[PDB]
Design an enzyme around this catalytic site. Structure first.
Site, short mmCIF file in Angstrom:
data_model
loop_
_atom_site.label_atom_id
_atom_site.label_comp_id
_atom_site.label_asym_id
_atom_site.label_seq_id
_atom_site.Cartn_x
_atom_site.Cartn_y
_atom_site.Cartn_z
N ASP A 44 -17.06 23.19 -18.57
CA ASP A 44 -17.97 22.98 -19.82
C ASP A 44 -18.22 21.27 -19.73
OD1 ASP A 44 -17.36 25.52 -20.65
OD2 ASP A 44 -15.81 24.48 -22.11
N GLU A 321 -20.63 31.62 -31.64
CA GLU A 321 -21.78 31.87 -30.82
C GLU A 321 -22.30 33.03 -31.41
OE1 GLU A 321 -19.64 31.92 -27.44
OE2 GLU A 321 -20.27 30.07 -26.55
N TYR A 439 -19.32 35.90 -20.56
CA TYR A 439 -20.67 35.97 -21.21
C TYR A 439 -21.80 36.89 -20.62
CZ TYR A 439 -19.33 31.52 -23.79
OH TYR A 439 -18.82 30.76 -24.81
#
Ligand code: SKD
Length: 485
Positions: A44, A321, A439
């Protein structure tokens, strides 16, 4: 040299790594996708990350060359193999700006495509962002604040005004400096330049070194004469031609609470309300370390203005999220990751201005840290009922055992937030339960098939960092997914 993919190592992005899928069928039948192009392994931000974009004009069957609509140039974009030993794997690019975590959304009334990403100043990610908005008020108006290179570190005595012109706020007078529509810096109308950095390893030592290649100096860069406040920003560009061309960069996080550390996107897609009082409203999910955790931003004027909504008073700063689906009356149901060991659901009967308290979703097993999920509406009835679909891992112990669920919506006889119930009737296993699955993003393709772009590994694990070509694309017809295991 290696042995289905939209983004892959050796494509036009020049990144060896991708994460964070977004997939969206447009009203025209064009299908688009976006992802992080993570150059410096799968880390990230802080890193070097650009947002990649790709398009299919045959209904999401085959894909064009990717482009990079949101990119920085402080560090070069190149294909590099990140080390995966116990020391080198943890190494991250320290001094680069980045775009991370995309959201795609279409306004079907205007046929405008919006692409959002988090916008991180050089060396910043969510975890080391400073508390603050990044904006100041000069006589009631909010402007992006800037630090001049010869001022005290804590001093932001300058602002980007509606001009593009940089003003000295102590004297309220225009300087000779300005930014263009990409936040690049100009003096006297001449582009200001800096040298681009390269990155190379020697053993496990990462060398970030200036090259001789000039790039536009940008207020988001480490080397700039004026610099933004080192917090997280929300960037957006729009396209009126399905991603052939893009607008100037819009910084939409003017509303960032002064008490917030970060305020970032729930990746995936946004939603345009189809039914009821708030038909036409564009809404995008967010989360924060702030007064609130879950939040949204919405627009009632087709994307020109955006209003921030706090959905709770959770100060946890968990990675909340979310993705949003619409009930048949126009009310909204949001499914979200939490840091509490379940997927939660919240409801809104006012187009997303207010939200119910979180209800755990019991059907799905997750970890304590959680994983992003994807939920979408489906246009056709399933078993005579309106249907939604949800993609997520299903495991308490790792990101693995991906499923696509189909939920059928019924009226409960009750009112408000309790009007509808969802029967998760069908559960399709993407692969063997042991296979990693992180994801994901679902879309309904123009033929009524379901497209899935997903991370086919465990993207949390410290033992699966820096894997190439793990973003896989699959298509299903609805009958295939109708499995009751
Ligand atoms: C803005 C940002 O950093 N987003 C990240 C966060 O979510 C992910 C995740 O895989 O869980 C990946 C996203 O790109 O990792 C981060 C998590 O907060 C702690 O690692």
């Amino acid at each position: 040299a290696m042995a289905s993919n939209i983004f892959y190592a050796g494509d036009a992005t020049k990144s060896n790594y991708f994460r964070i899928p977004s997939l969206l069928a447009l009203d025209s039948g064009t299908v688009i996708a976006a992802a992080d192009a993570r150059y410096g392994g799968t880390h990230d931000a802080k890193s070097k990350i650009n947002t990649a974009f790709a398009k299919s004009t045959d209904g999401g069957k085959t894909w064009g060359q990717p482009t990079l609509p949101l990119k920085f140039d402080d560090y070069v974009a190149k294909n590099i193999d990140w080390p995966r030993d116990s020391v080198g794997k943890n190494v991250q690019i320290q001094g680069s700006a980045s775009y991370i975590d995309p959201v795609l959304l279409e306004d079907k009334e205007t046929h405008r495509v919006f692409l959002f990403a988090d916008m991180m100043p050089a060396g910043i990610g969510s975890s080391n962002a400073s508390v603050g908005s990044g904006f100041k008020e000069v006589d009631g108006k909010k402007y992006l604040k800037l630090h001049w290179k010869d001022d005290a570190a804590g001093t932001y005595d300058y602002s980007v005004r509606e001009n593009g012109t940089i003003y000295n706020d102590t004297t309220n007078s225009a300087t000779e400096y300005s930014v263009d529509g990409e936040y690049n810096l100009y003096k006297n109308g001449n582009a200001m330049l800096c040298k681009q950095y390269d990155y190379n390893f020697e053993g496990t030592k990462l060398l970030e070194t200036q090259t001789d290649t000039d790039v536009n100096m940008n207020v988001f860069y480490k080397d700039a004469d004026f610099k933004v406040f080192p917090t997280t920003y929300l960037a957006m560009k729009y396209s009126d031609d399905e991603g052939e061309t893009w607008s100037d960069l819009q910084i939409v996080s003017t509303f960032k609470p002064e008490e917030s550390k970060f305020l970032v996107l729930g990746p995936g897609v946004g939603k345009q309300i189809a039914n009821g009082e708030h038909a036409g409203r564009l809404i995008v999910p967010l989360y924060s370390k702030s007064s609130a955790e879950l939040g949204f931003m919405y627009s009632d004027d087709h994307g020109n203005n955006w209003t921030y909504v706090e959905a709770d008073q959770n100060t946890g700063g968990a990675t909340a999220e979310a993705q949003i689906v619409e009930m048949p009356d126009g009310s909204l149901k949001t499914y979200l990751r939490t840091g509490s060991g379940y997927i939660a659901q919240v409801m809104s009967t006012d187009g997303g201005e207010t939200w119910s308290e979180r209800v755990p979703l019991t059907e799905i097993a997750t970890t304590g840290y959680g994983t992003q999920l994807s939920v979408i509406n489906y246009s056709q009835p399933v078993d005579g009922k309106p249907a939604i679909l949800l993609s997520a891992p299903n495991a308490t112990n790792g990101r693995k055992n991906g499923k696509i669920w189909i939920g059928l919506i019924s009226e409960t006889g009750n009112s408000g937030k309790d009007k509808y119930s969802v029967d998760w009737k069908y559960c399709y296993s993407v692969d063997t339960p042991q296979m990693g699955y992180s994801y994901s993003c679902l879309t309904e393709l123009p033929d009524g098939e379901i497209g899935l772009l997903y991370e086919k590994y465990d993207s949390w694990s410290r033992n699966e960092l820096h894997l190439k070509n793990i973003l896989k694309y699959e298509r299903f017809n609805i009958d295939e997914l109708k499995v009751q295991p």
